[PDB]
């Protein structure tokens, strides 16, 4: 559970490591995706099968009113769960994490489309 | 009615983790912007659809 450059038996890759639910044959030392990407490895000391997750990343989106209207903005970390964003008001959605936004309950009419039913607006 | 949204981290996709590659990309130019300004157009057009 840290974003690292790993290497097992010379096999470099980038990600975070976790203990698998998957199970290898006795003699295999690398495992892959349907897209032929090392999705798994078996540590040549402990042999316990490790699944690899590539670190979470993406385009920061930014939500702004008119420059005329304000200098306030909310910063959106798309796809990323917010649990590693402080390594670089806050809320979480299927579409990403809204930082600098007051999460309200009242379902107003839409203006700034975000995803999975979410959209934003500027109000008191 | 619509097709799935996609975006790509064109820099991570063309040379993941490499600064030496990144300085080669910085000779190519606008191709990384362009190759998501196109996909933004698709992404918004799904919402409008």
């Amino acid at each position: 559970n840290k974003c690292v450059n790993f290497n097992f038996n010379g096999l470099t890759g980038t990600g975070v490591l976790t203990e698998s639910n998957k199970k290898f044959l006795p003699f295999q030392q690398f495992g892959r995706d349907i897209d032929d990407t090392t999705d798994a490895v078996r540590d040549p000391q402990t042999l316990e099968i490790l699944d690899i997750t590539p670190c979470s990343f993406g385009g920061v989106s930014v939500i702004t009113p008119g420059t005329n209207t304000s200098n306030q903005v909310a910063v959106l970390y798309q796809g990323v769960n917010c649990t590693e964003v402080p390594v670089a008001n806050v809320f979480q959605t299927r579409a990403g994490c809204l930082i600098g936004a007051e999460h309200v309950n009242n379902s107003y009419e839409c203006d700034i489309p975000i995803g999975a039913g979410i959209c934003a607006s500027y109000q008191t | 009615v619509s097709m799935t949204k996609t975006s790509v981290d064109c820099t991570m996709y063309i040379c993941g983790d490499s600064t030496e590659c990144s300085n080669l990309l910085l000779q190519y130019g606008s191709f990384c912007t362009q190759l998501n300004r196109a996909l933004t157009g698709i992404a918004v057009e799904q919402d409008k659809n």
Binding site: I114 | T6, S7, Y13, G16
Partner: peptide
């Protein structure tokens, strides 16, 4: 009919959920 990837393509979610279109 029948989340990042290592190279940084991303499937990205819809604006309206599959419930909200049903509600339309």
């Amino acid at each position: 009919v029948t989340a990042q990837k290592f190279n940084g393509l991303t499937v990205l979610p819809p604006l309206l959920t599959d419930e909200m279109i049903a509600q339309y």
